[PDB]
Design a protein around this ligand. Structure first.
Ligand SMILES: COc1ccc2c(c1)c(CC(=O)O)c(C)n2C(=O)c1ccc(Cl)cc1
Length: 121
């Protein structure tokens, strides 16, 4: 679920999901179109695509379970949707962590009109 994903992001990066990753670039918090602005935004594009692989799951509300194994995120067995949603969120959180070195506050609250065209998953 959104809140869990937010906590996972905080644990991983030390940044609050909202507002650090809720309105970032073209795809974080509201993706849809355009070329991702940077690596972090690309994390969101892929996460969007990942959720898109699950048209009959409900990532915003469905809660999954995960544990920490010496820092590593391990998605624990739930329903198929929960397992897949967890792996999507896990990837995004790790991707955010791996790209903190280029994260730019200038992309927070990025305007929609600067995101043009469709980029295929
Ligand atoms: C390819 O791009 C997508 C597609 C679907 C998406 C998202 C991004 C995000 C992105 C986000 O909030 O990070 C959410 C939440 N989507 C959904 O969950 C969703 C769930 C159920 C149905 Cl039936 C349809 C869509």
């Amino acid at each position: 679920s959104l809140l869990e994903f937010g906590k996972m992001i905080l644990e991983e990066t030390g940044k609050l999901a909202i507002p650090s990753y809720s309105s970032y670039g073209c795809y974080c918090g509201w993706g849809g179109k355009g070329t991702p602005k940077d690596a972090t935004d690309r994390c969101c594009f892929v996460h969007d695509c990942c959720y898109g692989n699950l048209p009959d799951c409900n990532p915003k509300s469905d809660r999954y379970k995960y544990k920490r194994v010496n820092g590593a995120i391990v998605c624990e067995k739930g329903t198929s949707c929960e397992n897949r949603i967890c792996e999507c969120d896990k990837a995004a959180a790790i991707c955010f962590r791996q790209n903190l070195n280029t994260y730019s506050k200038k992309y927070m609250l990025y305007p929609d009109f600067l995101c043009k065209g469709e980029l295929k998953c």
